[PDB]
Amino acid sequence: MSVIRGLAAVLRQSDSDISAFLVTAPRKYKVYKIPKRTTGFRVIAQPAKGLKDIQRAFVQLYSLPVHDASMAYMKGKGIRDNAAAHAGNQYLLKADLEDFFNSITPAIFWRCIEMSSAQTPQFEPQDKLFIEKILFWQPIKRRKTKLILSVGAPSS
DNA sequence: GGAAGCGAAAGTGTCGCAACCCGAGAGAGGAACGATCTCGGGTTGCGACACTTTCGCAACCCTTAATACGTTC
């Protein structure tokens, strides 16, 4: 069963238990408000411990392509490298993205899978439903089709 | 995404005011009958404004978080 089999192998848990856990998994988030530095609050949704472990095992199991221009969440690279890339230069064009993490839906993730220029792990159609449960957060309880990436999750 | 309150924005009805019309009437002149100006309703058009509808700001944070110290998203 591909993905669930690998997750069971890594997490030392039965396939049936992991499959049963990944049914209401997108709802398994605890959301809290962290203070902003000047004023206001920031809403962060953090998954439960079991879902966190599942996400960590999944991201360790499957390696997705990343670019060398990305300096965030990369091993050995951080703030200093990002700043030093433009240390010797004169003009700059700092830009931002509009609600970046919450704008990544399962449709976007699956679309980017199929048109990638680099190697992409092969996903069976049976596990494509489980991938969405593993990765994405479901912020409204009544709406089940609204799935977005949540900052504060290990896989995001 | 969107409680509960509330207010913006836009559309629609309404209602009072002005403007005019039309019949009644006392009676100017000058020798009678009724000119002419006013009283009392009545109708219509119009525009300011009240009323009506829709939208949008943004509580809470869901059962489900972790808690050596600092930046960053």
Side-chain angles (χ1 to χ4, degrees):
Chain A
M1 71 192 315
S2 185
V3 169
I4 290 316
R5 176 74 268 169
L7 263 49
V10 189
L11 293 184
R12 280 96 65 187
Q13 293 179 356
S14 77
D15 291 331
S16 81
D17 286 334
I18 290 174
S19 286
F21 192 89
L22 302 167
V23 185
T24 184
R27 213 72 198 83
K28 268 150 184 306
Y29 283 65
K30 160 72 139 162
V31 65
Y32 49 89
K33 293 188 316 165
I34 66 161
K36 276 177 164 239
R37 264 149 185 157
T38 47
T39 187
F41 281 101
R42 208 169 266 262
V43 178
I44 309 289
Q46 186 175 180
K49 311 183 38 53
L51 182 57
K52 262 195 283 204
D53 298 337
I54 290 181
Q55 293 177 328
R56 296 214 191 79
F58 173 77
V59 298
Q60 273 300 90
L61 183 62
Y62 304 78
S63 179
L64 306 169
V66 294
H67 203 245
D68 291 331
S70 303
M71 295 296 172
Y73 320 121
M74 315 276 288
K75 311 276 189 174
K77 274 196 306 208
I79 286 308
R80 203 201 53 209
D81 289 330
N82 189 11
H86 316 285
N89 261 317
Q90 189 170 28
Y91 321 113
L92 73 165
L93 180 48
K94 187 268 183 182
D96 207 57
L97 289 146
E98 198 184 278
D99 213 22
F100 174 72
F101 274 97
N102 280 13
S103 284
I104 296 168
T105 51
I108 297 169
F109 173 60
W110 291 124
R111 172 145 47 61
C112 284
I113 301 299
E114 76 209 9
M115 61 79 71
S116 79
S117 67
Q119 186 174 359
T120 300
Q122 196 74 20
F123 282 146
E124 291 182 352
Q126 188 268 330
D127 56 58
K128 287 182 77 212
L129 269 296
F130 292 157
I131 300 299
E132 298 172 17
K133 293 182 183 293
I134 289 163
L135 300 182
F136 294 92
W137 170 44
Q138 180 200 133
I140 311 300
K141 187 269 183 182
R142 283 82 58 85
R143 206 175 316 174
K144 293 182 183 293
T145 61
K146 171 143 166 55
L147 288 166
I148 58 170
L149 269 194
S150 174
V151 70
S155 74
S156 281

